[PDB]
Amino acid sequence: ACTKNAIAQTGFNKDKYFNGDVWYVTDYLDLEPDDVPKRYCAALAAGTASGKLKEALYHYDPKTQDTFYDVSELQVESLGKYTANFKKVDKNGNVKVAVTAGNYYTFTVMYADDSSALIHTCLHKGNKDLGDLYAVLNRNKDAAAGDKVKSAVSAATLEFSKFISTKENNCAYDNDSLKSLLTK
């Protein structure tokens, strides 16, 4: 279960974050890691399509090859805090699993600038029991975390040394599909 009420960045710039470009997860902190953690790579595009906030997600497990995409409309709870009903889609946006109540994640932007971000997310999916996840994002895949985002990790009272890096995972990313999914 999730346990954190993450605080959104003061002065969060939504238009800059939701600009249609891609964010890569470079490091993450899972508060309830499984006994045997599945080391996935992940990226997202966040944008506005016809006035609606949207996110497209990409997950890739470089060992199992499991690969899946999602698209969500985001609903606003407050500035920088969203609730997202996801639908699983193929890379082209064709629906594989429809939106359903109880399948959603919350998403809080704790820090963001031009090139980096720190987010919190809580996933709810069926009758699964999932926990909090923090993620460091960068506009450049596998970019080393800079001082601004690392300081934000500290200011959130988290220890960056506890985060798991994706940068040495032999990750590959379908960024063109992520961008085009924003309309789907």
Ligand X SMILES: N[C@@H](CCS)C(=O)O
The footprint of ligand HEM (CB under 6 A) covers: 25, 28, 38, 40, 42, 44, 57, 59, 68, 70, 86, 88, 97, 105, 107, 121, 123, 125, 128, 135, 166
The site partner of 176 among ligand HEM, ligand X, none (C-beta below 5 to 8 Å per kind) is none
d(CA 102, CA 123): 10
Question: CA-CA distance, 18 to 35, in Å (whole number)?
Answer: 35
Residue keyed to tokens 């959603």 = 104
Residues in a beta bridge with 54? 47, 73
- Selected from 4, 13, 21, 30, the binder of ligand X by CB under 6 A is 30
Q: Which residues pair with 44 in a beta bridge?
A: 23, 57
- Binder of residue 86, out of ligand X, ligand HEM, none (CB less than 5 to 8 A by kind): ligand HEM
**From its phi and psi, is residue 110 left (phi > 0), alpha (psi between -120 and 50) or beta?**
alpha
Q: Examine residue 133 and tell whether it contacts ligand X (CB under 6 A).
A: yes
Please tell me whether residue 130 binds ligand X under the rule CB under 6 A.
yes
Residue numbers in the known binding site are: 59
